[PDB]
Enzyme design. Sequence first.
Site, PDB file in Angstrom:
ATOM      1  N   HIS B  16      80.729   3.827  52.359  1.00 28.61           N
ATOM      2  CA  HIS B  16      80.596   4.592  51.123  1.00 28.61           C
ATOM      3  C   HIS B  16      80.532   6.089  51.560  1.00 28.61           C
ATOM      4  CE1 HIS B  16      78.604   6.730  48.000  1.00 28.61           C
ATOM      5  NE2 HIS B  16      79.029   5.771  47.158  1.00 28.61           N
ATOM      6  N   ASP B  18      79.086   8.909  50.745  1.00 31.46           N
ATOM      7  CA  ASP B  18      77.777   9.529  50.914  1.00 31.46           C
ATOM      8  C   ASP B  18      77.093   8.961  52.148  1.00 31.46           C
ATOM      9  OD1 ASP B  18      77.865  11.163  48.582  1.00 31.46           O
ATOM     10  OD2 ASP B  18      76.944   9.568  47.332  1.00 31.46           O
ATOM     11  N   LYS B  19      77.165   7.630  52.320  1.00 32.56           N
ATOM     12  CA  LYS B  19      76.569   6.984  53.473  1.00 32.56           C
ATOM     13  C   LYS B  19      77.240   7.385  54.763  1.00 32.56           C
ATOM     14  CE  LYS B  19      72.647   5.293  52.586  1.00 32.56           C
ATOM     15  NZ  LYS B  19      72.128   6.262  53.607  1.00 32.56           N
ATOM     16  N   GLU B  44      73.709  19.010  57.502  1.00 31.82           N
ATOM     17  CA  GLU B  44      74.363  18.401  56.364  1.00 31.82           C
ATOM     18  C   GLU B  44      75.801  18.018  56.730  1.00 31.82           C
ATOM     19  OE1 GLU B  44      72.050  17.961  54.481  1.00 31.82           O
ATOM     20  OE2 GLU B  44      70.835  19.800  54.284  1.00 31.82           O
ATOM     21  N   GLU B  57      71.814  24.044  60.160  1.00 25.48           N
ATOM     22  CA  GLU B  57      71.091  24.820  61.135  1.00 25.48           C
ATOM     23  C   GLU B  57      70.547  23.957  62.244  1.00 25.48           C
ATOM     24  OE1 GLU B  57      69.727  24.690  57.792  1.00 25.48           O
ATOM     25  OE2 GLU B  57      71.439  25.928  57.178  1.00 25.48           O
ATOM     26  N   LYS B 168      79.909  -0.997  47.186  1.00 26.26           N
ATOM     27  CA  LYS B 168      78.683  -0.792  46.413  1.00 26.26           C
ATOM     28  C   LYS B 168      78.292  -2.148  45.863  1.00 26.26           C
ATOM     29  CE  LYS B 168      78.074   3.044  44.094  1.00 26.26           C
ATOM     30  NZ  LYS B 168      78.229   4.124  43.071  1.00 26.26           N
ATOM     31  N   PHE B 237      90.700  -1.263  43.768  1.00 29.37           N
ATOM     32  CA  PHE B 237      89.941  -0.344  44.592  1.00 29.37           C
ATOM     33  C   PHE B 237      90.632  -0.282  45.962  1.00 29.37           C
ATOM     34  CE2 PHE B 237      85.075   0.182  45.925  1.00 29.37           C
ATOM     35  CZ  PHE B 237      85.332   1.365  46.563  1.00 29.37           C
ATOM     36  N   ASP B 245      86.399   9.634  46.749  1.00 30.86           N
ATOM     37  CA  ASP B 245      85.199  10.279  46.221  1.00 30.86           C
ATOM     38  C   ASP B 245      84.537  11.097  47.294  1.00 30.86           C
ATOM     39  OD1 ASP B 245      82.947  10.671  44.469  1.00 30.86           O
ATOM     40  OD2 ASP B 245      81.890   8.957  45.378  1.00 30.86           O
ATOM     41  N   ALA B 246      84.370  12.408  47.064  1.00 29.57           N
ATOM     42  CA  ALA B 246      83.699  13.252  48.050  1.00 29.57           C
ATOM     43  C   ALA B 246      82.273  12.806  48.285  1.00 29.57           C
ATOM     44  CB  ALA B 246      83.660  14.688  47.569  1.00 29.57           C
ATOM     45  N   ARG B 251      72.674  12.061  49.202  1.00 31.53           N
ATOM     46  CA  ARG B 251      73.075  11.699  47.841  1.00 31.53           C
ATOM     47  C   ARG B 251      72.841  10.197  47.561  1.00 31.53           C
ATOM     48  NH1 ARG B 251      76.425  15.330  44.672  1.00 31.53           N
ATOM     49  NH2 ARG B 251      77.205  13.375  43.763  1.00 31.53           N
ATOM     50  N   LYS B 252      72.115   9.509  48.452  1.00 30.11           N
ATOM     51  CA  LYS B 252      71.774   8.104  48.260  1.00 30.11           C
ATOM     52  C   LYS B 252      70.282   7.924  48.540  1.00 30.11           C
ATOM     53  CE  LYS B 252      75.389   6.303  46.569  1.00 30.11           C
ATOM     54  NZ  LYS B 252      75.531   7.644  45.924  1.00 30.11           N
ATOM     55  N   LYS B 272      67.711  15.450  59.777  1.00 24.64           N
ATOM     56  CA  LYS B 272      66.516  16.267  59.917  1.00 24.64           C
ATOM     57  C   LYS B 272      65.572  15.748  60.980  1.00 24.64           C
ATOM     58  CE  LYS B 272      66.529  17.278  54.903  1.00 24.64           C
ATOM     59  NZ  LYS B 272      65.796  17.106  53.638  1.00 24.64           N
ATOM     60  N   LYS B 276      60.662  18.329  59.449  1.00 25.50           N
ATOM     61  CA  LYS B 276      61.048  18.315  58.042  1.00 25.50           C
ATOM     62  C   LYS B 276      60.302  17.132  57.420  1.00 25.50           C
ATOM     63  CE  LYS B 276      64.443  20.991  59.766  1.00 25.50           C
ATOM     64  NZ  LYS B 276      64.345  21.597  61.125  1.00 25.50           N
ATOM     65  N   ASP B 278      60.199  16.046  54.510  1.00 20.91           N
ATOM     66  CA  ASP B 278      60.969  15.172  53.610  1.00 20.91           C
ATOM     67  C   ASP B 278      61.186  13.793  54.233  1.00 20.91           C
ATOM     68  OD1 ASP B 278      61.524  16.831  51.410  1.00 20.91           O
ATOM     69  OD2 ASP B 278      63.407  17.568  52.294  1.00 20.91           O
TER      70      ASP B 278
HETATM   71  C1  SAM Z   1      62.656  25.354  54.541  1.00 16.66           C
HETATM   72  S1  SAM Z   1      64.392  25.162  54.139  1.00 16.66           S
HETATM   73  C2  SAM Z   1      64.835  23.546  54.866  1.00 16.66           C
HETATM   74  C3  SAM Z   1      64.737  23.538  56.387  1.00 16.66           C
HETATM   75  C4  SAM Z   1      65.856  24.354  57.062  1.00 16.66           C
HETATM   76  N1  SAM Z   1      67.180  23.733  56.789  1.00 16.66           N
HETATM   77  C5  SAM Z   1      65.586  24.491  58.555  1.00 16.66           C
HETATM   78  O1  SAM Z   1      66.633  24.767  59.266  1.00 16.66           O
HETATM   79  O2  SAM Z   1      64.457  24.408  59.009  1.00 16.66           O
HETATM   80  C6  SAM Z   1      64.423  24.680  52.442  1.00 16.66           C
HETATM   81  C7  SAM Z   1      64.283  25.799  51.434  1.00 16.66           C
HETATM   82  O3  SAM Z   1      63.092  26.562  51.731  1.00 16.66           O
HETATM   83  C8  SAM Z   1      63.308  27.922  51.384  1.00 16.66           C
HETATM   84  N2  SAM Z   1      63.142  28.755  52.572  1.00 16.66           N
HETATM   85  C9  SAM Z   1      64.109  29.264  53.401  1.00 16.66           C
HETATM   86  N3  SAM Z   1      63.643  30.068  54.324  1.00 16.66           N
HETATM   87  C10 SAM Z   1      62.284  30.125  54.057  1.00 16.66           C
HETATM   88  C11 SAM Z   1      61.231  30.848  54.648  1.00 16.66           C
HETATM   89  N4  SAM Z   1      61.387  31.691  55.676  1.00 16.66           N
HETATM   90  N5  SAM Z   1      59.998  30.697  54.121  1.00 16.66           N
HETATM   91  C12 SAM Z   1      59.831  29.859  53.093  1.00 16.66           C
HETATM   92  N6  SAM Z   1      60.736  29.109  52.471  1.00 16.66           N
HETATM   93  C13 SAM Z   1      61.957  29.306  52.995  1.00 16.66           C
HETATM   94  C14 SAM Z   1      64.695  28.009  50.741  1.00 16.66           C
HETATM   95  O4  SAM Z   1      64.527  27.798  49.338  1.00 16.66           O
HETATM   96  C15 SAM Z   1      65.399  26.833  51.414  1.00 16.66           C
HETATM   97  O5  SAM Z   1      66.506  26.352  50.659  1.00 16.66           O
HETATM   98  C1  SAM Z   2      83.228   5.739  41.108  1.00 17.88           C
HETATM   99  S1  SAM Z   2      83.064   6.970  42.400  1.00 17.88           S
HETATM  100  C2  SAM Z   2      82.377   8.425  41.535  1.00 17.88           C
HETATM  101  C3  SAM Z   2      83.337   9.003  40.502  1.00 17.88           C
HETATM  102  C4  SAM Z   2      84.540   9.723  41.141  1.00 17.88           C
HETATM  103  N1  SAM Z   2      84.080  10.915  41.903  1.00 17.88           N
HETATM  104  C5  SAM Z   2      85.568  10.086  40.076  1.00 17.88           C
HETATM  105  O1  SAM Z   2      86.378  11.038  40.416  1.00 17.88           O
HETATM  106  O2  SAM Z   2      85.642   9.472  39.026  1.00 17.88           O
HETATM  107  C6  SAM Z   2      81.613   6.513  43.293  1.00 17.88           C
HETATM  108  C7  SAM Z   2      81.786   5.417  44.320  1.00 17.88           C
HETATM  109  O3  SAM Z   2      82.387   4.264  43.689  1.00 17.88           O
HETATM  110  C8  SAM Z   2      83.217   3.595  44.627  1.00 17.88           C
HETATM  111  N2  SAM Z   2      84.586   3.557  44.121  1.00 17.88           N
HETATM  112  C9  SAM Z   2      85.636   4.382  44.433  1.00 17.88           C
HETATM  113  N3  SAM Z   2      86.771   4.021  43.889  1.00 17.88           N
HETATM  114  C10 SAM Z   2      86.455   2.855  43.207  1.00 17.88           C
HETATM  115  C11 SAM Z   2      87.234   1.952  42.462  1.00 17.88           C
HETATM  116  N4  SAM Z   2      88.552   2.083  42.267  1.00 17.88           N
HETATM  117  N5  SAM Z   2      86.611   0.875  41.938  1.00 17.88           N
HETATM  118  C12 SAM Z   2      85.296   0.733  42.127  1.00 17.88           C
HETATM  119  N6  SAM Z   2      84.456   1.526  42.786  1.00 17.88           N
HETATM  120  C13 SAM Z   2      85.109   2.570  43.323  1.00 17.88           C
HETATM  121  C14 SAM Z   2      83.060   4.321  45.967  1.00 17.88           C
HETATM  122  O4  SAM Z   2      81.974   3.703  46.661  1.00 17.88           O
HETATM  123  C15 SAM Z   2      82.706   5.729  45.491  1.00 17.88           C
HETATM  124  O5  SAM Z   2      82.010   6.481  46.480  1.00 17.88           O
END
Ligand code: SAM
Ligand code: SAM
Lengths: 382, 382
Positions: B16, B18-19, B44, B57, B168, B237, B245-246, B251-252, B272, B276, B278
């Site tokens: 998938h 996202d996965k 990311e 980063e 899915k 499919f 699908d991007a 996102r999961k 991460k 982090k 999270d």
């Molecule tokens: C802390 S960052 C996530 C971790 C980061 N990607 C890293 O490389 O450590 C998440 C969010 O915190 C905020 N952030 C960025 N720099 C920060 C800083 N110096 N102090 C506090 N919050 C910050 C921004 O809103 C950013 O999108």
């Molecule tokens: C349905 S798509 C999200 C909508 C899509 N971005 C669009 O342009 O309509 C989400 C997920 O569904 C699955 N998918 C993609 N094509 C499909 C299809 N033809 N039938 C069923 N599921 C599908 C894939 O796992 C995909 O990442």
Amino acid sequence: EEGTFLFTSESVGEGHPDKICDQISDAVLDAHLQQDPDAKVACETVAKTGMILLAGEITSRAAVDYQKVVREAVKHIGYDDSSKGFDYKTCNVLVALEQQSPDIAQGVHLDRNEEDIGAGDQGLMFGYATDETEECMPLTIVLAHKLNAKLAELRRNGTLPWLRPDSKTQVTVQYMQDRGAVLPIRVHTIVISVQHDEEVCLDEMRDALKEKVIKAVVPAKYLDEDTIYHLQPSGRFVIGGPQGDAGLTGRKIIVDTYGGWGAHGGGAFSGKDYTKVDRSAAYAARWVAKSLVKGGLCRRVLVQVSYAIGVSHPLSISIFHYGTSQKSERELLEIVKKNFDLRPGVIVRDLDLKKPIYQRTAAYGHFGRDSFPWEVPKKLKY
Amino acid sequence: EEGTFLFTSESVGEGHPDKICDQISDAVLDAHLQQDPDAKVACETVAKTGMILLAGEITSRAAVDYQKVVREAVKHIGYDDSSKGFDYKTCNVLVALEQQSPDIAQGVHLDRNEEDIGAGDQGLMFGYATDETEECMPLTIVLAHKLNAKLAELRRNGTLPWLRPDSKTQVTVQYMQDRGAVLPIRVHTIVISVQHDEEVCLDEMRDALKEKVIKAVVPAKYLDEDTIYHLQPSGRFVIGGPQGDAGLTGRKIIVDTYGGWGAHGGGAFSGKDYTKVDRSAAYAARWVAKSLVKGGLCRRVLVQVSYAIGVSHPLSISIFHYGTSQKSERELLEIVKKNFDLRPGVIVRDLDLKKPIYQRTAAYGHFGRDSFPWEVPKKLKY
Ligand SMILES: C[S@@+](CC[C@H](N)C(=O)[O-])C[C@H]1O[C@@H](n2cnc3c(N)ncnc32)[C@H](O)[C@@H]1O
Ligand SMILES: C[S@@+](CC[C@H](N)C(=O)[O-])C[C@H]1O[C@@H](n2cnc3c(N)ncnc32)[C@H](O)[C@@H]1O
Ligand SMILES: Cn1cc2cc(-c3cc4n[nH]c(C5CC5)c4n(-c4ccc(OC(F)F)cc4)c3=O)ccc2n1
Ligand SMILES: Cn1cc2cc(-c3cc4n[nH]c(C5CC5)c4n(-c4ccc(OC(F)F)cc4)c3=O)ccc2n1
């Protein structure tokens, strides 16, 4: 005290990099809907230093200038100079957009009556409402959003010119349990982090955040000698926006909804047209939940729905009232069945989801604000 | 029946889109941790037709070949030919990775004792556990993950060679309420959608999905004459993976956790390092929840924690036992205080979070599998 508990929610500002992506994704959706109400849009945005990338799928009759739409959204947010870490005039805008997959199109909407269009994907979605505020939202998330909005207001009006667009806030409230419903007692902790210029010192920022931001938003009755304040807790936040942290569309789904209250099915809202039930069914579920609370049937309620790609009717519907209704889950489900039609091709009509108002939803939460259609309760018949 | 309700959860396969991103983000994290246990990673991933982009980063002493790491992860997933829509050998790998912001570094970990490192961000996180399964996970999400794993097994062993990596699944179970705890009764609905080759017909796929996938995973006692099956409900499919699908990292998040049960604070796990919260605090909160259930203090429990960037101790801790404990929330909080230290610089030691096992967590859920440290309950003293 016995019968009390803490709950924390966060929010982010318009220039938080994930939120930048949500707003750009929805600016692209709105641009398409202005010309083609039936545009099929699935626009992801990614932001990193100097870069906005659009990736996804769009099938539409609109002629959209992505460079202009993206740059105008970034300008609105306030990233207009290299000193701030990002500039709409000079950033890179990259586009990797293709048509919607014909396999998805044929299985969802091609040659289908609008009311009978299939869900654009499978998935689960929840709606939630609580009578603790007039707008039927948790106080934790409402306050967290309002703190970010206040920062943007003071930045834009020149009161605190050292502020930059990227911010985060977090509010912890102590609640009293009340027969399944909740009653806010006090604000236990507030966090505020906001990007700032090189010249302002930490003490000036902390003082302004307490006096001009917190006091201007949070009622004094909730603040006391024990309230904990974490104001600019990192000590320095000059680097910010996409330069400080890569952003993506759909990475603030809990900020977009209920701040952790209720429940979430995982789907992102921004960049998607009505056929993507991640958005339309979540909006309809909020509408149902708010209608049950404003209709006096419950004080606090959670609604789950789910779908299969290509199938119009939801696969499941569930209602949990937290013990706040005299009616059973079965009775509430019957009321919802008699009053709502949760097919996406009917939700679009009830909630006017071809209208280009989506960029307005993409910061400060999608719910509890501005009397959008999903916030206007339906009068229930039973 | 009275006292019963429906609940739906979904899962997705390794291919998938996202996965794919989550797995690549964690392959990059693991590659860094193999050489530098203290690497600061915030990677990311974005995937669209022919493209893997890394954005984020990283500050690390490791020398990582991103081209090789990314391509090997895609090869493992099974995207190895243009006929499948994506090929690790010939795709574009783009890298937009910079050092961690020095402003974040100075506020979080620079010149800090490891046990006293600050949280890498603010945020809220939840842990959940339920005694309905031995692994203390909701049956809906366990079954949904196992259906995807079965598809990958039959693809890899050549049993169903028309299968492709993108899939899915979705499972709806009818539950009986039991004094706050839940008891699964039956499977109400199953959805399966999986990418396939151009040659296989719909009837062959539907038959195989029922006989070789569902029957091989879901106990017959849960399936009856009323169970609804939506098998390849889109009808076609062939186009799939990033081409269809991007995909983006994080996102999961509901598939990664509890399938909608419990609660979620919004943070993504993959890409991460331990600082982090999270990820690390969500893993620790799962560990606490599972320890409370395996310790016999409750049957079902939700734990919330929250942090401020730069601050080591959590800002708030809350426990909700759904009415399944004889102890009060206050007593359970005291037990947790006496038995756990939820500073990130202590969680790292308890859960061994510098070990490069993260790619293994990035499909089929982070919880309820393989006896990872957060799945081994702590013996509680009280
Ligand atoms: C802390 S960052 C996530 C971790 C980061 N990607 C890293 O490389 O450590 C998440 C969010 O915190 C905020 N952030 C960025 N720099 C920060 C800083 N110096 N102090 C506090 N919050 C910050 C921004 O809103 C950013 O999108
Ligand atoms: C349905 S798509 C999200 C909508 C899509 N971005 C669009 O342009 O309509 C989400 C997920 O569904 C699955 N998918 C993609 N094509 C499909 C299809 N033809 N039938 C069923 N599921 C599908 C894939 O796992 C995909 O990442
Ligand atoms: C008689 N009565 C009993 C009540 C109990 C509670 C209540 C207490 C509580 N302690 N800790 C939490 C959660 C961990 C933070 C509590 N939650 C709670 C549960 C789920 C929530 O949403 C989402 F997170 F799943 C939000 C809050 C309550 O609902 C509330 C009202 C009541 N009335
Ligand atoms: C005496 N007793 C009463 C009980 C009630 C329920 C219970 C019923 C129920 N109906 N619909 C739902 C939700 C909408 C789908 C229910 N939920 C529920 C609530 C929150 C959940 O997590 C997350 F979504 F917030 C998961 C399930 C219950 O917990 C369960 C056990 C019990 N025992």
